[PDB]
Amino acid sequence: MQNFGAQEMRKGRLAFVRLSKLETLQNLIDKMLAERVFNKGEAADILESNDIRADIARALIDSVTKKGDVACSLFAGAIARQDVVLADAMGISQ
Amino acid sequence: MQNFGAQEMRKGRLAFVRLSKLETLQNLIDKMLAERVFNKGEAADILESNDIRADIARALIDSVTKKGDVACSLFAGAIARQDVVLADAMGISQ
């Protein structure tokens, strides 16, 4: 441990949100599962960010589609090379 | 090369939003940058509007803070062991 309470964690919040790397966040969450601070449901919730994920997907595919057929065709080739199942669900050749 | 234009891309839109993994999405953004489909400004619009990392960080530190001082102290201990810059910025000594 360290002697560092909730008052001190509130004062450190902005730095933590700004500066923490994603790899650090995943390890911290695993460490709080190992210490029994989190149960699996809580860790799952913290990790889940499907709404932002889907919003990234909308922005990406909408930016591609606006550029027309040649961009869409490059995009579809790249999807096939990245995830075969997603390509197949979309109608893309593999 | 595929011939997979905008029409087909719109018909696969809902599958792409629901089924894409986050790592796929980040890879595709890099690929579309590589292919000169995007300029650096476009690839950053997509990502900077939708920071999953910041979302995970806020949910994490707020779960810990609400559990009180022991949990906060364990959390601070693990931060110090992970990232010395984060630890220094938040007031944690190491």
Domains of chain B by residue range? 6-48, 52-89
Compute the distance between CA of residue A68 and CA of residue A13 in angstroms, rounded to an integer. 44
A51 token code pair: 């709404």
A30 token code pair: 């695993």
Show contacts of A13-16: CB within 8 Å, 24+ apart: A13/B61, A13/B65, A15/B86, A15/B89, A15/B90, A16/B57, A16/B61, A16/B79, A16/B86, A16/B89, A16/B90
Q: Chain B partners of A30 at a C-beta cutoff of 8 Å?
A: none
Give the other-Cβ count within 10 Å of B40's Cβ.
8
Inter-chain residue contact B73 with A1, CB threshold 8 Å: yes
**According to the entry, how was the structure determined?**
X-ray
Inter-chain residue contact A21 with B83, CB threshold 8 Å: yes
Compute the distance between CA of residue A69 and CA of residue B56 in angstroms, rounded to an integer. 36
Query: In A20-94, where does DSSP find H-type helix?
Result: 22-34, 40-47, 50-66, 69-82, 84-90
Q: Chain A partners of B79 at a C-beta cutoff of 8 Å?
A: 16, 24, 28
